[PDB]
Amino acid sequence: NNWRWFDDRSGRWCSYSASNNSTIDSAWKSGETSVRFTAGRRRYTVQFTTMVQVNEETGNRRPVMLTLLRVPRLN
Amino acid sequence: NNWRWFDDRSGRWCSYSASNNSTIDSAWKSGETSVRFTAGRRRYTVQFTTMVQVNEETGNRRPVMLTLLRVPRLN
Amino acid sequence: NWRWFDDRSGRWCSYSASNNSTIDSAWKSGETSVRFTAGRRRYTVQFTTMVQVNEETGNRRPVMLTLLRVPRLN
Amino acid sequence: NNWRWFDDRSGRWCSYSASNNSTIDSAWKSGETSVRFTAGRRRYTVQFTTMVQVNEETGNRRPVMLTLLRVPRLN
Ligand SMILES: Nc1ncnc2c1ncn2[C@@H]1O[C@H](COP(=O)(O)OP(=O)(O)OP(=O)(O)O)[C@@H](O)[C@H]1F
Ligand SMILES: Nc1ncnc2c1ncn2[C@@H]1O[C@H](COP(=O)(O)OP(=O)(O)OP(=O)(O)O)[C@@H](O)[C@H]1F
Ligand SMILES: [Cl-]
Ligand SMILES: [Cl-]
Ligand SMILES: [Cl-]
Ligand code: NA
């Protein structure tokens, strides 16, 4: 649950499924500039150079974020 | 120019003014959970626990992000 | 992505692929520390102080986590 | 005070003075590859491309680190 996408309808950041988070995070860690994934009948590209997810069918843009863990870690 | 808010009308992340970026970043660094700033008389609150900016005149919620620079630096 | 500083050489040093994966798996899991071995020596990484501890001698060497830029560059 | 330097004598990361932290952090945020500061009777260079600080009088090297705050912030 390290990646999130923003929902403008509700005004909240939302989690991805475990499998879609893994697909996104694997591409992030591999140095890719973008990644494609599917959810049901929906098709998306996450653009890491802009931190935006684009619906491939409609062009709708949803912002994305990467959660960050504190360094150093707290006790 | 390290903080950004997402403009849903244009579909792009946007920088704050130098003054507003400083107000936000100083609150971030001091451990505050939120911060108020203005653009002229227009009032906003950034909520750091949700990474959302609340327009205190329209109520619209826009996501925010903190840009992160690479560690170590290149070159 | 994890590095330890070698004061003998004056440089940050990478871990082996397996030790990097062990450390990073504990980091991502939210643990406060992680055990590994290097060269028949036992070590603990303490994430709350960002140091590696030699379990035999007590010697502390600093560690660091490299960070990727957000957003990514084109 | 977000920057730290490692003290091998005590085995701990240590904070900078407010002013020296500010000098370092301003160069960091400005995109510079290194920065010099003076503390006491010594000049030091922080090399951001290696995350190492060099004492320019003696040549002694100490590792540095940049603390990171959690995103999003906890309540
Ligand atoms: N309630 C909702 N309203 C509108 N749109 C939604 C949505 N809930 C998810 N979406 C869209 O869907 C993407 C993947 O969201 P995600 O949770 O990974 O989707 P699924 O559970 O179907 O995953 P999977 O079964 O592995 O394909 C997400 O960015 C968002 F764009
Ligand atoms: N106790 C100590 N032992 C060994 N070395 C030390 C040290 N204390 C500071 N150093 C050296 O000096 C640098 C700046 O350390 P810093 O605290 O910003 O400098 P000042 O002393 O001017 O601070 P202040 O007393 O608060 O005004 C620091 O990286 C390190 F290299
Ligand atoms: Cl949006
Ligand atoms: Cl969509
Ligand atoms: Cl020194
Ligand atoms: Na040295």
| First-residue to last-residue Cα separation of chain A | 22 Å
Oligomer: homotetramer
The fraction of residues in strands of chain A falls at 35-45%
Order of helices and strands of chain A: EEHEEEE
The largest pleated sheet of chain A is described as: 6 strands, antiparallel
The number of helical runs of chain A is 1
Quick one: overall form of chain A? Answer: globular
**Proportion of helical residues of chain A:** 10-25%
Main structural class of chain A: alpha+beta
Number of domains of chain A: 1
Largest beta sheet: strand ordering of chain A: 2-1-6-5-4-3
Ligands in the model, by name, code or SMILES, are: the ligand Nc1ncnc2c1ncn2[C@@H]1O[C@H](COP(=O)(O)OP(=O)(O)OP(=O)(O)O)[C@@H](O)[C@H]1F, chloride ion, sodium ion
Subcellular location (chain C): Cytoplasm; Nucleus; Mitochondrion
Protein name (chain C): E3 ubiquitin-protein ligase HUWE1
Family (chain C): Belongs to the UPL family. TOM1/PTR1 subfamily.
In short:
With 75 residues, chain A is of the alpha+beta class.
Descriptive report:
The structure is a homotetramer. In chain A, strands 2-1-6-5-4-3 form a six-stranded antiparallel β-sheet, with helices on one face. The radius of gyration of chain A is 13 Å and the shape is globular. Chain A has one helix at residues 18-29; strands spanning 3-7, 12-15, 34-39, 42-47, 52-55, 61-66. The longest helix of chain A has 12 residues, at 18-29. The first copy, chain A, has one domain (1-75). With 75 residues, chain A is of the alpha+beta class. At the B-D interface, loops of B face loops of D. Bound molecules: ligand YGC (2 copies), chloride ion (CL) (3 copies) and sodium ion. Chain C: Belongs to the UPL family. TOM1/PTR1 subfamily. Chain C: Residues 1-65 form the WWE domain.
